[PDB]
Design a protein around this ligand. Structure first.
Ligand SMILES: Nc1ncnc2c1ncn2[C@@H]1O[C@H](COP(=O)(O)OP(=O)(O)OP(=O)(O)O)[C@@H](O)[C@H]1O
Ligand SMILES: Nc1ncnc2c1ncn2[C@@H]1O[C@H](COP(=O)(O)OP(=O)(O)OP(=O)(O)O)[C@@H](O)[C@H]1O
Lengths: 732, 732
């Protein structure tokens, strides 16, 4: 059976290489698409069989039969479709010029940015979502009367993914001379020099480089534009934020969306609801208006209404792994606030992806390409939450549900569920669960709902029974009263995330699951006792709990909210690579050996400063004023968060030197008198005071962002005075 | 089984020919890459099976089974992937013009070289590493105000690997006339004559020939440039040193590297450490700055950071054997000082490559292409040590570890080690050894560490056990207390290099290994007794020991530090091809028959000069003044090194005539009075005096390099006076 496993592994590797090769091009051939789907199904079957054999080897007849039948299927596919297997390995946009809604103020903003500045060649980059309207705004600015009056020469160059520098340079030359047959033998650099002479002969010039996709194209084309100490400007529209390094183009409002839809259809509650569902994207409004123009003007045909090639331009530029990472963001429901940490852990568990660094790099790559929107950011600048735009969400859902079978949103029949690979259900979870589903190839069970669900006791073991091959089990919105004997049979589990109301103890049978990477226990009990062999899990990396978990007496990276009785030297000696640590166990009971620790959280007198780790970067104290001199000696502390009565006192005088502090966060304190000088916070950048101000922080060079919340008006006056003395101040 | 061995040899030969053919082109097809990897794996398996059969034949059932299964695998591969097997058989650079750091002095140097010289057409060649900045410096010089003022005509020609002479000539012509349609029927020689007329009509001309790759291109393009007795100049940038036969472009300093990185990212300790790790290569700085511009400006995302197509241009021009020789240099750790002799012997033993002459030619070819950097050179001009640049080291490591599986740096599992071919481990050697690794296909075990390691006795036979197919065993950084019975079972050994502290005797069972080529015994004992049948090793070529080895009573080329009791006529009659010989055995105890000897070393009254070999070229005496008249009669001696009290005396008067001496090396002597004239050293070029001067050596025509070290200031004054009377003098 082992040699059969090796042969099946070789077949699966060749099929995976074929799938990776065919993903480089989109095929419209239906036979090729069907063959690709068949090959993907066989690949999934082979993966499941190999994982089953691996689990049995770690711990057989049915496994052998499955391996034989999958090998036979592979041979049949190779023999039958050999020829198909071998065969499977410029229009500038027309934008609106007459009825442009909402861009009247953004156009003036960009124009005033173009008409003002230094005397050098400056660039005004416009970045935005696919179909946001960057070309429309660039055209409105390009044909504006003020721009035409100020700029003697205006040139519109349409760059794209595919362009020829010689063709572009000869197109630019034709705007100045008609005898372009004299350049048939000059090189592209001589063409650029000729363009430089042409542009320098006149006055100021404005150049619109539309749809720049890489900095390489920008550098190659820029050699034709002189910098002759005149206020020459370049207007650049791009999807990627890297090419702009800007002006982030706005979204249309609800009223503007309705205005655009009404103008496009008619040169109504149903119409207003249709325009509201486009989320301020003019491309969606245009597409839906083109669809509505063909239907009759009847309220019943507009209630039935309640593109794809433009998005594919940026989706086809993603790598093979980044495409699967991007499509997995469509599993989260529409408008959902995706937690970045949860998304990263899910990506690592699904096998798409230190691994955390690569996953954060993938998320930042998706954000830079404007495929993912950021809303919440951490105080230190990291991303906290994100979401997909509704058109991007629809694209991801359609692609991953139809063409890739990455996941299926849920009722499917017994024949349909046998082909599903991942399940995402957030509505009518109990109704689907009561049907007793059974999927032998389902690898993930996702349930992202913000409403808590209590799982009936009679239905407790249905998911571990019907889906025994689960690798990801994210049911943190479902309360599990108890664990059945079938949960411990999920030997393939890598990501487990459950919520509970009465689970005060983790059984030792959890340690029988040696594939666990992330163990998230969201319980409302005050204390939790983890009896499972945490240290015997060789693949465990993160352990998140919201209670005071008590660990039993290398790859581990996070130990969130453990009890201080579990802060022994023996326990900390088993986790040399720990980076984030939290304690929520009556701090008064009590980490030096953790030389890689960066995040520390204590939730409820400070010891000498030499006891705390010297490499700590972020420290947060919750429910625990002159004691801050101990935290001042921390030479590497950069973020300090005080939440929920973290530091209580009346008078605080700044004495210690926070040589590395960048963010100071104080929440729910009784501080009355605070005296400080610029010397005590040399590197301060971020200051947040919520539900709580010496004028010495205006002398700080790095102080640029200050956040204020509800408090006495004297604090608001002090903040306003500090702002008067770019600074960002917000008071609420 | 013999006929099966012949059939498998034929199959392996065909597969090797296929692998050699596909290496001529880089394939981006993933299916093709997987097929190439599979074919390489099968080739390795066939090679191991054939060598096992050869060893058994020299000295069976398992060998037959392995041969049958490998033949079946070959047939299956041939039948399955026949179509894939059959299918498997211009952008000038844009460089920085505004922010160029560090080149302000190099540009002035090259400019003063261009503006000064004779009245003929001179060339200023700029040679350097891939990405060093030759094009940037050439562009800075080309657009310099002084160059523009002095040279009326300046032409920038971009040569590359692929160029068309007609296209280049028509591009040059277009710089002088716009009616280039009159040249549609002239030959390229008439085009060159027209260019000659155009360039001779004006004044002086400067021409920048960028990226010249072969002297043939230089000769073909040079026919268009007249030599009209004006100070016409050509600026040439190339990677190969042969095309320049120059100006070796400098590397950016650490401060300059940080300046460039800061300028590129921001138009920090982490930033300084990132710029320091680029090793002064502006291409690496540019790439890392482009990478950093996409990440957020947070200290945590800059600590996570702690191209390839440019290097591939020079790597793809290497031959099939030179590519493997080059990638093997990446086995040595980063920044390691690779000994040239050890590298050559390793290349010969690995089968990449008299053989020593070819290996030295390969090393010099790699050096000329600027793929390998030379730091230490022998006193006679030969190369002693070398290293790889860190970008080249990374390229070699990545290529040989991912795409070729040439070697793997080390923990890998039992399934992963079954595919490894060579192992390089220099950190945590004992930890990996204690895991008891077992690789049935591992052919080399490399450990290049400068820190000595004592090998536990319980772990002594682990390497000969887990790796029974070893061909190269370089563990000279590991001390072996004793030899286990498994060491003598390594019948495939070709290169054995071990260190020891108490091994005073080599067992006779070493002679059972008849495949040994290099036998390096690095022991700290004063004397060593080699009982193995050295003369029975028909393939032994080099025998290096640091102790007084006592040999027992044709291919041999080196016998380093043997005892003079082993300098008998009988022993020397068995080695007619010996070229290097050393003796470290109390020289007072005592080679004429060695008619091919070149190097002789005696380590502790001279006999008549007719006793010493007449062919001797280099002689070194260690611990052994009027006796130098005996060495003077040596008509072919060119290098004479005196180290560690080699020649002791008070007064030395030069009498003998060193008609062929080129290098004189004196170290740690008590010489007080030295009298000499130009007649006694007619051919002297190199003079080194360390830890020890008549003015008669200034009359020597060939005296150009003099090296001095710590001594009395009178010697420094004499050296300075000699320099006053190009000469290279260094005093420390
Ligand atoms: N403010 C607007 N008013 C009216 N129509 C608009 C407006 N903005 C965009 N459109 C229209 O919606 C579509 C959006 O395409 P457009 O070229 O403006 O987008 P883009 O930002 O350049 O996107 P892409 O990245 O795909 O090039 C076009 O048909 C355009 O005419
Ligand atoms: N001194 C410098 N200051 C700033 N940027 C530099 C400097 N030297 C090189 N660069 C930049 O680094 C890269 C090096 O490429 P460059 O063309 O200068 O190298 P090269 O010596 O011609 O190499 P190749 O053999 O690959 O052609 C370019 O992007 C160039 O702009």
């Amino acid at each position: 059976v082992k040699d059969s496993a090796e042969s099946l592994l070789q077949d699966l590797n060749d099929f995976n290489a074929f799938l990776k090769q065919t993903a480089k091009s989109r095929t419209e051939n239906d036979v090729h698409k069907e063959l690709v789907k068949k090959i993907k199904t066989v690949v999934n079957s082979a993966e499941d069989a190999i994982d089953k054999f691996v689990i049995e080897a770690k711990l057989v007849y049915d496994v052998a039969g499955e391996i034989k039948t999958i090998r036979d299927k592979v041979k049949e596919i190779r023999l039958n479709n050999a020829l198909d297997l071998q065969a499977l390995q410029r229009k500038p946009p027309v934008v609106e010029e007459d009825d442009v809604v909402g861009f009247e103020e953004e156009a003036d903003k960009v124009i005033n940015r173009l008409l003002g500045g230094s005397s050098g060649l400056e660039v005004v980059p416009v970045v935005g979502m696919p179909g946001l309207g960057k070309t429309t705004l660039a055209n409105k600015i390009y044909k504006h009367p003020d721009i035409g009056y100020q700029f003697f020469t205006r040139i519109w160059v349409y760059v794209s993914q595919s362009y020829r520098r010689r063709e572009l340079f000869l197109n630019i030359i034709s705007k100045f001379t008609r005898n372009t047959k004299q350049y048939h033998d000059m090189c592209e650099e001589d063409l650029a020099d000729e363009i430089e002479d042409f542009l320098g002969k006149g006055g100021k010039y404005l150049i619109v480089l539309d749809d720049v996709w890489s900095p390489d194209a920008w550098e190659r084309i820029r050699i034709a534009f002189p910098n002759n100490n005149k206020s020459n400007r370049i207007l650049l529209t791009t999807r990627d934020s890297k090419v702009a390094k800007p002006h982030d183009l706005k979204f249309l409002t609800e009223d503007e969306s309705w205005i655009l839809l009404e103008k496009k259809v008619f040169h109504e509650l149903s119409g207003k609801s249709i325009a509201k569902k486009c989320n301020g994207l003019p491309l969606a409004i245009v597409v839906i208006a083109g669809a509505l123009i063909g239907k009759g003007k009847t309220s019943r045909e507009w209630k039935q209404v309640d593109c794809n090639k433009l998005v594919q331009l940026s989706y086809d530029r993603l790598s093979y792994d980044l495409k699967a990472c991007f499509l997995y963001c469509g599993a989260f429901p529409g408008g959902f606030e995706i937690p970045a940490w949860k998304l990263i852990r899910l990506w690592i568990a699904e096998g798409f992806i230190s691994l955390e660094c690569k996953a954060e790099d993938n998320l930042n790559d998706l954000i830079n390409r404007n495929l993912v929107m950021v809303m919440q950011r951490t105080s230190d600048g990291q991303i906290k939450t994100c979401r997909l735009h509704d058109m991007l969400h629809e694209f991801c859902r359609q692609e991953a549900m139809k063409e890739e079978n990455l996941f299926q949103e849920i009722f499917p029949g017994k024949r349909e569920l046998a082909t599903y690979r991942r399940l995402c259900i957030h509505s009518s979870v109990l109704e689907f669960i009561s049907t007793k589903p059974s999927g032998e190839h389902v690898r993930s069970f996702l349930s992202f709902s913000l409403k808590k669900i209590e799982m009936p006791s009679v239905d407790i073991p249905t998911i571990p029974k019907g889906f025994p091959l689960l690798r990801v089990f994210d049911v943190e919105s479902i309360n599990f009263s108890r664990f059945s004997k079938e949960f411990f049979q999920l030997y393939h589990l890598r990501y487990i995330a459950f919520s509970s109301d009465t689970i005060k103890i983790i059984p030792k049978h959890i340690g029988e699951l040696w594939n666990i990477q992330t163990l998230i226990i969201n319980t409302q009990q005050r204390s939790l006792d983890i009896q499972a062999n945490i240290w015997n899990m060789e693949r465990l990396r993160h352990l998140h709990t919201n209670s005071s978990a008590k660990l039993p007496v290398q790859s581990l990276q996070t130990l969130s909210t453990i009890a201080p009785e579990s802060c022994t030297e023996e326990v900390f000696a088993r986790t040399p690579n720990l980076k984030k640590l939290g304690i929520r166990g009556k701090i008064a009971v009590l980490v030096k050996k953790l030389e890689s620790l960066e995040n520390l959280k204590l939730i409820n007198r400070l010891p000498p400063s030499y006891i705390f780790p010297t490499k700590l970067r972020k420290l947060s104290l919750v429910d625990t004023w002159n004691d801050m001199s101990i935290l001042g000696q921390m030479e590497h502390l950069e973020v300090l968060k005080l939440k929920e009565n973290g530091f209580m006192g009346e008078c605080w005088e700044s004495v210690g030197g926070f040589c590395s502090l960048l963010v100071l966060w104080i929440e729910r304190t009784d501080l009355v008198s605070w005296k400080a000088s610029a010397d005590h916070f040399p590197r301060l950048k971020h200051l947040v005071l919520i539900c709580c101000i010496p004028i010495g922080l205006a002398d700080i060079r790095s102080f640029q962002v200050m956040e204020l919340q509800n408090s006495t008006k004297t604090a608001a006056i002090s903040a306003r005075g500090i702002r008067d003395k770019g600074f960002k101040l917000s008071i609420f």
